Amino acid sequence: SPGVVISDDEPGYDLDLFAIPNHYAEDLERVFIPHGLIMDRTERLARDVMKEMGGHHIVALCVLKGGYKFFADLLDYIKALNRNSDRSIPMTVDFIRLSTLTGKNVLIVEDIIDTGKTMQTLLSLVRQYNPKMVKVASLLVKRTPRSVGYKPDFVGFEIPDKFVVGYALDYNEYFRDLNHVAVISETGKAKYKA
Amino acid sequence: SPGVVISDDEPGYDLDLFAIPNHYAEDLERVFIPHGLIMDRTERLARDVMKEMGGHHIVALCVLKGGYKFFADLLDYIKALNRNSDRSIPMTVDFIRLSTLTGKNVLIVEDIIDTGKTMQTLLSLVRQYNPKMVKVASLLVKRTPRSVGYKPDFVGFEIPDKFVVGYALDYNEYFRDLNHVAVISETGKAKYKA
Amino acid sequence: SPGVVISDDEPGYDLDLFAIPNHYAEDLERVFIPHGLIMDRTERLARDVMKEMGGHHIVALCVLKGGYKFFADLLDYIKALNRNSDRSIPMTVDFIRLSTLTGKNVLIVEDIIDTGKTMQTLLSLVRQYNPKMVKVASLLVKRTPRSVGYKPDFVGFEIPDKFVVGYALDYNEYFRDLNHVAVISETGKAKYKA
Amino acid sequence: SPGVVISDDEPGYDLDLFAIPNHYAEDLERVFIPHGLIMDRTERLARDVMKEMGGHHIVALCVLKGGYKFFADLLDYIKALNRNSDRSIPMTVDFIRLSTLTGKNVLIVEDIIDTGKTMQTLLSLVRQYNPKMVKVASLLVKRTPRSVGYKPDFVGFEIPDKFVVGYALDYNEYFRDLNHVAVISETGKAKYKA
Ligand SMILES: Nc1nc2c(ncn2[C@@H]2C[C@@H](CO)N(C(=O)CCP(=O)(O)O)C2)c(=O)[nH]1
Ligand SMILES: Nc1nc2c(ncn2[C@@H]2C[C@@H](CO)N(C(=O)CCP(=O)(O)O)C2)c(=O)[nH]1
Ligand SMILES: Nc1nc2c(ncn2[C@@H]2C[C@@H](CO)N(C(=O)CCP(=O)(O)O)C2)c(=O)[nH]1
Ligand SMILES: Nc1nc2c(ncn2[C@@H]2C[C@@H](CO)N(C(=O)CCP(=O)(O)O)C2)c(=O)[nH]1
Ligand SMILES: [Mg+2]
Ligand SMILES: [Mg+2]
Ligand SMILES: [Mg+2]
Ligand SMILES: [Mg+2]
């Protein structure tokens, strides 16, 4: 499934309908995915992953310079599933940045997939170490003409081609205290520029 | 405002996109409002309450029956605002089914407004005990044609005229354990028909 | 079991080890149970309830006087258990203060038991209607020489004979926004005296 | 302060008082720190951190391969604080396994400090790069005569010198789904030695 599809015509939500940090009022255009909807979708992703790969030990890999926050929530949800199974399932968690992967189930966790080049490159590397199974979970997949066409195994949301921030998605180290996925405004785009 | 508006043409969410209890698979048609999204709206709703009624001792009245979950969540967010206020703020809670209110800010918390006759009756009575102020917060407002035209002060979501269950909204004491607000199915109403 | 026993030797927890609202700094002596501990114990209480009341429809009964918060948290953990039972489980919730109890398992939920005379009185009236079973769940049971000897079926915490506030336990409508169970100070009990 | 001190005489909690995954029933002896109590303390630590060094931009370093769970949670609380600060506070989140730090407020986050040889070493490296200041937050400090004497700047819990698992503390990648800090049993010690 392509996940939750936010279409190009869907405007999103007015900033006034949800709680927003006041220091970002002029910095955001609109709210795409409230923090609460991200959690509800992420909980479902954890069940899809466990149903498909969680039978035994997995290696979950967070791609650095990315969405550590989404890796953390997804692993929280996975742990809750394991916490109510009858088996004690071990689990390796590591962080990768672009040897013991061989023979194991590898889940790669990314926060956003824009062009898809990063993930396209990462998989070639991981697959040269020949693992039994390598799957990718991405919170957001952006619909962009700049995309090479890659399709993650597990997709939280499919969003229009807009620059988004909040939850896991910083912008020059700002916006990590924003828990909703919003579209950045030109005022904010230039305010926190580097 | 009318709250978060859910239009008649928006289908909703497919059930496979979120975690729903297995035994309710065939009892639902669509997820309108995931649990996490309810929470986001309710947090802002609480900020709106303290903005209009934070100036006097508030009495929070939960309308029975079947509207208690939203009440607890809303008060949790209100209390979190008072504990950040740097002042000792007293607050009264109470439950009401069809003398302290005198001179206080009275918040009538309702889960669903359909015909609006319930809230119409209650307001007329509550105003008799000459409160400083009477406002109604409602999680859901149904666009039902049988509406006598009453608009509450704080609305979570304005939704189509569909029979909805989940989060706070039960049906013959069923669906309490469902956290999302979903439309019931024909199988749903028949199976659990009292 | 007697529950989680907090002995008279234990001074609880220094106030500065936890987040307590600043306006309550001088109004408290010590923290007995942090909010997080309450929740973890309450989750286990929900299991113990289902283990010996899960065979028949439950009527959950909240005694009006303060236990609403703890009622809500206990019910949420019950609902989580049912969510994962792969069975549609109906449940009634009502409120009681100082008829359809014909023959279902009645669960009376209380925040605190001091002398025990309230529970003794209530159980005498409820058993008159001849329910299948009546059980009592209390968050706190005080170790008090004033006790009439009533011990509930499920106990969260057995504490020393001190006047506690926070979480579900208000004091003349004050301390609602306090999340932890803390001992009130003499300066605090005078400051908010009714 | 040495944090929350768990005495050598303290037995911890009987496993029957809290929700414990069934597959670990025989693998644990006692519970020292329920998950919720960890959170309540970690929330206080986030406030101590921000008051002391959170006025400006901080670099948060998680030490791998330790307790990313604690790192993620301490940072969730930090973000919640910044989210109400009325200022856009930038933050750097990085990981390290044992020049951009120069002139920055550097917080090292560790799950457990046993002998202290890791922090002693880590601090000597970081201090060569001339940060504006470097501080250590550790969830658990073990009271052990194997200790080289290092005491972190922020301590969650000072615990006896026993082998603990749960919450961010794994044993050969097991116990990652256990959310309480419990003492492993000698059975569990050799069951997962792998
Ligand atoms: N906050 C925010 N940052 C964005 C967004 N789009 C792109 N970026 C940046 C730019 C680029 C830098 O390398 N990033 C990647 O993640 C490469 C993944 P690839 O394109 O290879 O799939 C992050 C956005 O919408 N919001
Ligand atoms: N689960 C669920 N129950 C619904 C829905 N609509 C109506 N009810 C029932 C019927 C009616 C009482 O007869 N209720 C009210 O709350 C009166 C509000 P009023 O019409 O006075 O404004 C509850 C729905 O959509 N979902
Ligand atoms: N906040 C707070 N109030 C307390 C505490 N002890 C007693 N009360 C009050 C007084 C008494 C009278 O109504 N209450 C009962 O709940 C009856 C339970 P009974 O004695 O019948 O078993 C509430 C305390 O420690 N903290
Ligand atoms: N699950 C669990 N692992 C423990 C415990 N004590 C020690 N370890 C291991 C052993 C040692 C070696 O790598 N570790 C460190 O973290 C170095 C910190 P140092 O000694 O440099 O201060 C982790 C425990 O109690 N529970
Ligand atoms: Mg990334
Ligand atoms: Mg109602
Ligand atoms: Mg009471
Ligand atoms: Mg470590």
PDB file of N, CA and C in Angstrom, chain C residues 72-110:
ATOM      1  N   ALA C  72     -10.614   6.722  35.602  1.00  0.00           N
ATOM      2  CA  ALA C  72     -10.340   6.838  34.171  1.00  0.00           C
ATOM      3  C   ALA C  72      -9.090   6.062  33.774  1.00  0.00           C
ATOM      4  N   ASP C  73      -8.019   6.165  34.566  1.00  0.00           N
ATOM      5  CA  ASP C  73      -6.797   5.446  34.221  1.00  0.00           C
ATOM      6  C   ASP C  73      -6.990   3.936  34.327  1.00  0.00           C
ATOM      7  N   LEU C  74      -7.691   3.467  35.364  1.00  0.00           N
ATOM      8  CA  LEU C  74      -7.922   2.029  35.483  1.00  0.00           C
ATOM      9  C   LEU C  74      -8.762   1.509  34.322  1.00  0.00           C
ATOM     10  N   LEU C  75      -9.790   2.264  33.927  1.00  0.00           N
ATOM     11  CA  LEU C  75     -10.643   1.834  32.822  1.00  0.00           C
ATOM     12  C   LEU C  75      -9.872   1.794  31.506  1.00  0.00           C
ATOM     13  N   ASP C  76      -8.940   2.730  31.302  1.00  0.00           N
ATOM     14  CA  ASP C  76      -8.156   2.712  30.071  1.00  0.00           C
ATOM     15  C   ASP C  76      -7.281   1.462  29.980  1.00  0.00           C
ATOM     16  N   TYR C  77      -6.752   0.982  31.110  1.00  0.00           N
ATOM     17  CA  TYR C  77      -5.927  -0.226  31.041  1.00  0.00           C
ATOM     18  C   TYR C  77      -6.772  -1.477  30.857  1.00  0.00           C
ATOM     19  N   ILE C  78      -7.950  -1.507  31.473  1.00  0.00           N
ATOM     20  CA  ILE C  78      -8.910  -2.561  31.173  1.00  0.00           C
ATOM     21  C   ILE C  78      -9.217  -2.576  29.680  1.00  0.00           C
ATOM     22  N   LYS C  79      -9.576  -1.414  29.127  1.00  0.00           N
ATOM     23  CA  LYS C  79      -9.919  -1.351  27.710  1.00  0.00           C
ATOM     24  C   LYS C  79      -8.771  -1.847  26.836  1.00  0.00           C
ATOM     25  N   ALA C  80      -7.527  -1.560  27.225  1.00  0.00           N
ATOM     26  CA  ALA C  80      -6.395  -2.078  26.463  1.00  0.00           C
ATOM     27  C   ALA C  80      -6.344  -3.599  26.523  1.00  0.00           C
ATOM     28  N   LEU C  81      -6.602  -4.177  27.698  1.00  0.00           N
ATOM     29  CA  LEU C  81      -6.657  -5.632  27.796  1.00  0.00           C
ATOM     30  C   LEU C  81      -7.730  -6.211  26.877  1.00  0.00           C
ATOM     31  N   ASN C  82      -8.915  -5.594  26.838  1.00  0.00           N
ATOM     32  CA  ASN C  82      -9.977  -6.132  25.995  1.00  0.00           C
ATOM     33  C   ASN C  82      -9.648  -5.950  24.518  1.00  0.00           C
ATOM     34  N   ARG C  83      -9.086  -4.794  24.160  1.00  0.00           N
ATOM     35  CA  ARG C  83      -8.623  -4.561  22.794  1.00  0.00           C
ATOM     36  C   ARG C  83      -7.819  -5.740  22.259  1.00  0.00           C
ATOM     37  N   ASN C  84      -7.029  -6.380  23.118  1.00  0.00           N
ATOM     38  CA  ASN C  84      -6.147  -7.460  22.700  1.00  0.00           C
ATOM     39  C   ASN C  84      -6.713  -8.842  23.004  1.00  0.00           C
ATOM     40  N   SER C  85      -7.968  -8.929  23.430  1.00  0.00           N
ATOM     41  CA  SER C  85      -8.585 -10.207  23.752  1.00  0.00           C
ATOM     42  C   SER C  85      -9.210 -10.887  22.541  1.00  0.00           C
ATOM     43  N   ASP C  86      -9.217 -10.224  21.383  1.00  0.00           N
ATOM     44  CA  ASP C  86      -9.867 -10.735  20.171  1.00  0.00           C
ATOM     45  C   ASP C  86     -11.326 -11.123  20.423  1.00  0.00           C
ATOM     46  N   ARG C  87     -11.969 -10.463  21.393  1.00  0.00           N
ATOM     47  CA  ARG C  87     -13.381 -10.666  21.708  1.00  0.00           C
ATOM     48  C   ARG C  87     -14.054  -9.324  21.956  1.00  0.00           C
ATOM     49  N   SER C  88     -15.260  -9.153  21.410  1.00  0.00           N
ATOM     50  CA  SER C  88     -16.049  -7.970  21.724  1.00  0.00           C
ATOM     51  C   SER C  88     -16.567  -8.059  23.155  1.00  0.00           C
ATOM     52  N   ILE C  89     -16.116  -7.143  24.003  1.00  0.00           N
ATOM     53  CA  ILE C  89     -16.446  -7.203  25.422  1.00  0.00           C
ATOM     54  C   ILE C  89     -17.197  -5.930  25.793  1.00  0.00           C
ATOM     55  N   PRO C  90     -18.494  -6.017  26.079  1.00  0.00           N
ATOM     56  CA  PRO C  90     -19.224  -4.835  26.539  1.00  0.00           C
ATOM     57  C   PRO C  90     -18.858  -4.520  27.977  1.00  0.00           C
ATOM     58  N   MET C  91     -19.089  -3.270  28.367  1.00  0.00           N
ATOM     59  CA  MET C  91     -18.809  -2.858  29.733  1.00  0.00           C
ATOM     60  C   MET C  91     -19.653  -1.636  30.063  1.00  0.00           C
ATOM     61  N   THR C  92     -20.254  -1.639  31.248  1.00  0.00           N
ATOM     62  CA  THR C  92     -21.019  -0.497  31.725  1.00  0.00           C
ATOM     63  C   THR C  92     -20.158   0.351  32.654  1.00  0.00           C
ATOM     64  N   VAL C  93     -20.381   1.662  32.610  1.00  0.00           N
ATOM     65  CA  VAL C  93     -19.738   2.610  33.513  1.00  0.00           C
ATOM     66  C   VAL C  93     -20.806   3.547  34.058  1.00  0.00           C
ATOM     67  N   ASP C  94     -20.867   3.674  35.382  1.00  0.00           N
ATOM     68  CA  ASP C  94     -21.806   4.576  36.035  1.00  0.00           C
ATOM     69  C   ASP C  94     -21.078   5.294  37.162  1.00  0.00           C
ATOM     70  N   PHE C  95     -21.790   6.197  37.831  1.00  0.00           N
ATOM     71  CA  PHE C  95     -21.239   6.948  38.948  1.00  0.00           C
ATOM     72  C   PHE C  95     -22.181   6.850  40.140  1.00  0.00           C
ATOM     73  N   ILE C  96     -21.596   6.868  41.337  1.00  0.00           N
ATOM     74  CA  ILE C  96     -22.328   6.683  42.583  1.00  0.00           C
ATOM     75  C   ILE C  96     -21.935   7.776  43.566  1.00  0.00           C
ATOM     76  N   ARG C  97     -22.884   8.152  44.422  1.00  0.00           N
ATOM     77  CA  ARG C  97     -22.653   9.105  45.498  1.00  0.00           C
ATOM     78  C   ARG C  97     -23.477   8.677  46.706  1.00  0.00           C
ATOM     79  N   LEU C  98     -23.123   9.220  47.869  1.00  0.00           N
ATOM     80  CA  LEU C  98     -23.819   8.904  49.115  1.00  0.00           C
ATOM     81  C   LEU C  98     -25.334   8.991  48.954  1.00  0.00           C
ATOM     82  N   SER C  99     -30.121  -0.789  40.761  1.00  0.00           N
ATOM     83  CA  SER C  99     -31.299  -1.223  40.021  1.00  0.00           C
ATOM     84  C   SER C  99     -30.916  -2.187  38.899  1.00  0.00           C
ATOM     85  N   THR C 100     -30.070  -1.718  37.981  1.00  0.00           N
ATOM     86  CA  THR C 100     -29.506  -2.575  36.947  1.00  0.00           C
ATOM     87  C   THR C 100     -28.292  -3.361  37.441  1.00  0.00           C
ATOM     88  N   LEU C 101     -28.102  -3.432  38.757  1.00  0.00           N
ATOM     89  CA  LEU C 101     -27.107  -4.303  39.380  1.00  0.00           C
ATOM     90  C   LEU C 101     -27.681  -5.673  39.699  1.00  0.00           C
ATOM     91  N   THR C 102     -28.550  -6.183  38.818  1.00  0.00           N
ATOM     92  CA  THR C 102     -29.321  -7.388  39.120  1.00  0.00           C
ATOM     93  C   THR C 102     -28.416  -8.598  39.319  1.00  0.00           C
ATOM     94  N   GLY C 103     -27.514  -8.845  38.375  1.00  0.00           N
ATOM     95  CA  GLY C 103     -26.675 -10.019  38.486  1.00  0.00           C
ATOM     96  C   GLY C 103     -25.468  -9.981  37.577  1.00  0.00           C
ATOM     97  N   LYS C 104     -24.737  -8.877  37.608  1.00  0.00           N
ATOM     98  CA  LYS C 104     -23.485  -8.756  36.888  1.00  0.00           C
ATOM     99  C   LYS C 104     -22.380  -8.475  37.897  1.00  0.00           C
ATOM    100  N   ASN C 105     -21.135  -8.686  37.483  1.00  0.00           N
ATOM    101  CA  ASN C 105     -20.007  -8.400  38.363  1.00  0.00           C
ATOM    102  C   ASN C 105     -19.903  -6.894  38.541  1.00  0.00           C
ATOM    103  N   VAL C 106     -20.138  -6.417  39.756  1.00  0.00           N
ATOM    104  CA  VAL C 106     -19.996  -5.001  40.061  1.00  0.00           C
ATOM    105  C   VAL C 106     -18.570  -4.746  40.521  1.00  0.00           C
ATOM    106  N   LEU C 107     -17.937  -3.744  39.920  1.00  0.00           N
ATOM    107  CA  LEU C 107     -16.613  -3.270  40.301  1.00  0.00           C
ATOM    108  C   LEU C 107     -16.761  -1.849  40.830  1.00  0.00           C
ATOM    109  N   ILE C 108     -16.513  -1.664  42.123  1.00  0.00           N
ATOM    110  CA  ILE C 108     -16.532  -0.343  42.740  1.00  0.00           C
ATOM    111  C   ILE C 108     -15.103   0.172  42.805  1.00  0.00           C
ATOM    112  N   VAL C 109     -14.882   1.359  42.256  1.00  0.00           N
ATOM    113  CA  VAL C 109     -13.556   1.946  42.129  1.00  0.00           C
ATOM    114  C   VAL C 109     -13.495   3.158  43.047  1.00  0.00           C
ATOM    115  N   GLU C 110     -12.454   3.224  43.868  1.00  0.00           N
ATOM    116  CA  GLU C 110     -12.282   4.301  44.830  1.00  0.00           C
ATOM    117  C   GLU C 110     -10.848   4.801  44.746  1.00  0.00           C
TER     118      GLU C 110
END
